[PDB]
């Protein structure tokens, strides 16, 4: 009805466009422009870690709604409830991502109204947008991966995981998730087998946190298994996925390794951070000639066959630089991953020691692993940052 669009204009009067129109935020008049900018840059930190782990940055299907991501942010939990009347989806949540619409619906909130800030919640839900676009073929809720609870622990656990994405230090654990784990009685911790068979029909939802613990355990202590699992999902190889799950679930030593990892996480609760974008992203960086940015980045990261695209956003322009990295002799796909991450984070941290504050906006990932005929590690490498040269 014209009555509903009229209401929607009133509740979401502001429109902010990023990335040549592929990332749109509509927001209430009480949502600060500062917060809008933080959410854009948060998306890039999460996107970068996700593509490093998964190894793919090409949309799986052509012409889906999520070619454009739309975020709708109501002013408050109270005005959020009008979203059910307006767009016909549930508001019994802190937010909701609807894949067929490429739309995330949520609301700004005070620390008194939720434990999770808006940026922290967005970091989690944006991970679902990434899973659906770049990892899980077909629509959410369909196909073999949406039977037998196959991906329930994974989808929620990795969303909690990737919400802890940082700029230069990989993925870090979040205080709030570690707090839930720390408050559990030790002998009520989920076994590895129980976590990998948990469902949304469960009654307690602690599985989100034990699912995170699985993801973080694999990330930190068994990255080969984590890569093989993601490759199985990416290739819709149900057989390989089920074999991995069965091997993890039936091995008593793997569960003890996982239990000990939970204890390490719990021990880290007190001093754990909440990864959120730096204020550096909001500073005025000053002019820097564009080709000097590209040249300096390409040299520090030892890239060849480089290309660059520039994109327009509400408040700034950005660039995406792509190149090929060819390193030394491969120590295998999994030991290669680890050294590539260390190299890329070191390069990002070296560039940020530069006087140009614009280098503090850089995010980077690698994808499409392969070895050369000379058995040399090779990757496509992608950098993203602000561009202050019109
Ligand atoms: O829909 P909600 O209610 O917005 C949701 N919000 C969450 C917020 C945080 Cl920050 C964390 Cl820790 C987990 C969450 N999981 C969900 P989910 O989509 O899987 O129900
Ligand atoms: O992201 P933040 O949270 O903006 C950051 N702030 C810092 C503040 C000070 Cl005062 C010092 Cl000395 C170091 C910092 N390092 C960081 P970094 O990016 O390298 O983790
Ligand atoms: Ca999908
Ligand atoms: Zn979720």
Residues 346 and 383 in one domain: yes
- Spatial distance between the Cα atoms of 237 and 274, rounded to a whole number of angstroms: 35
Residues 262 and 196 in one domain: yes
How far is ligand 3, taken at its centre, from the CA of residue 20, in Å? 23
To the question of whether residue 128 is assigned a binding role by annotation, the answer is yes
To the question of whether residue 132 is assigned a binding role by annotation, the answer is yes
Q: What six digits make up the tokens of 237?
A: 């190889």
Exposure of 353 in the CB half-sphere (CA atoms within 13 A): 6
Residues 364 and 248 in one domain: no
- The experimental method, as deposited, was X-ray
The verdict on whether 125 is a catalytic residue reads yes
The torsion angles phi and psi of 142, rounded to 5 degrees, stand at: -130, 155
Ligand 2 within 6 A of CB of 280: yes
Residues 194 and 231 in one domain: yes
CB-based contact 235:54 (threshold 8 Å): no
Ligand 1 within 6 A of CB of 170: no
CB-based contact 59:105 (threshold 8 Å): no
How far is ligand 4, taken at its centre, from the CA of residue 195, in Å? 15
CB-based contact 73:27 (threshold 8 Å): yes
Q: 94, 121, 139 — which closes off a domain?
A: 139
Q: 79, 109, 139 — which closes off a domain?
A: 139
Ligand 1 within 6 A of CB of 24: no
Residues 103 and 157 in one domain: no
In Å, the largest CA–CA distance within the chain is 66
Q: What six digits make up the tokens of 189?
A: 């911790």
CB-based contact 229:241 (threshold 8 Å): yes
Q: In the 8-state DSSP scheme, what is residue 75?
A: S
Q: 282, 297, 330 — which closes off a domain?
A: 282
Q: In the 8-state DSSP scheme, what is residue 274?
A: -
- What is the resolution of the experimental data for this entry, in Å? 2.0
CB-based contact 26:14 (threshold 8 Å): yes
Q: What six digits make up the tokens of 326?
A: 């060819």
How many domains, the chain?
3
According to DSSP, the residues that pair with 384 across neighbouring strands are: 320, 363
Q: Please count the residues of the chain.
A: 390
Residues 261 and 297 in one domain: no
Residues 262 and 148 in one domain: yes
Atom of ligand 2 nearest to the CA of 279: 4
Report which bound ligand comes closest to the CA of 128.
Answer: 4
Query: How does 174-204 read in b/e, with b if 16+ C-beta sit within 10 Å?
Result: bbbbbebbbeeeeeebbebbebbbbeeeeee
Domain range holding 350?
283-390
Residues 118 and 74 in one domain: yes
Residues 363 and 343 in one domain: yes
- Cross-sheet strand order for the sheet of 103-107: 14-18, 23-27, 69-74, 103-107, 95-98
Residues 211 and 335 in one domain: no
- Spatial distance between the Cα atoms of 320 and 306, rounded to a whole number of angstroms: 11
CB-based contact 178:129 (threshold 8 Å): no
Residues 92 and 135 in one domain: yes
Residues 248 and 170 in one domain: yes
């Amino acid at each position: 009805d014209k009555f509903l669009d009229d209401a929607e204009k009133h509740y979401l009067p502001k429109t902010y466009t990023f990335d040549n129109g592929t990332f749109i935020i509509r927001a209430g008049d009480k949502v600060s422009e500062e917060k809008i900018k933080r959410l854009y840059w948060a998306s890039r930190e999460v996107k970068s870690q996700f593509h490093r782990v998964v190894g793919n940055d090409k949309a799986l299907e052509v012409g889906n709604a999520d070619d454009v991501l739309t975020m709708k942010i109501f002013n408050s939990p109270e005005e959020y409830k009008f979203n059910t009347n307006i767009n016909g989806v549930s508001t019994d949540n802190g937010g909701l991502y609807i894949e067929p619409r490429g739309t995330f619906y949520t609301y700004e909130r005070t620390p008194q109204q939720s434990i999770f800030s808006l940026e922290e919640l967005f970091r989690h839900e944006y991970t679902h947008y990434l899973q659906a676009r770049y990892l899980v073929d077909g629509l959410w809720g369909q196909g073999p991966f949406y039977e037998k609870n196959r991906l329930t622990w994974f989808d929620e656990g990795t969303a909690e995981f990737f919400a802890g994405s940082t700029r230069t230090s990989g993925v870090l654990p979040r205080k709030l998730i570690l707090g839930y784990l720390a408050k559990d009685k030790v002998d009520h911790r989920y076994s590895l087998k129980k976590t990998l068979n948990s469902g949304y029909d469960d009654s307690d939802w602690m599985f989100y946190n034990y699912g995170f613990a699985v993801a973080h355990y694999l990330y930190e202590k068994d990255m080969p298994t984590f890569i093989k699992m993601n490759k199985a999902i990416l290739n819709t190889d149900v057989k390989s996925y089920d074999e991995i799950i069965k091997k993890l679930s039936d091995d008593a030593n793997k569960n003890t390794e996982y239990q000990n990892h939970i204890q390490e996480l719990v021990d880290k609760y007190q001093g754990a951070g909440i990864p959120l974008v730096s204020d550096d992203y909001l500073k005025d960086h000053g002019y820097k000639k564009a080709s000097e940015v590209y040249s300096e980045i390409s040299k520090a990261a030892s890239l060849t066959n480089t290309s660059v695209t520039a994109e327009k956003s509400q408040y700034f322009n950005t660039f995406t630089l792509r190149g090929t990295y060819t390193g030394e002799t491969s120590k295998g796909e999994f030991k290669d991953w680890d050294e590539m991450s260390k190299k890329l984070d070191g390069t990002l941290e070296s560039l940020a020691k530069n006087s140009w504050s614009g280098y503090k906006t850089l995010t980077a990932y690698f994808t499409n692993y392969r070895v050369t005929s000379d058995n040399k590690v090779q990757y496509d490498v992608v950098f993203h940052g602000v561009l202050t040269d019109n």
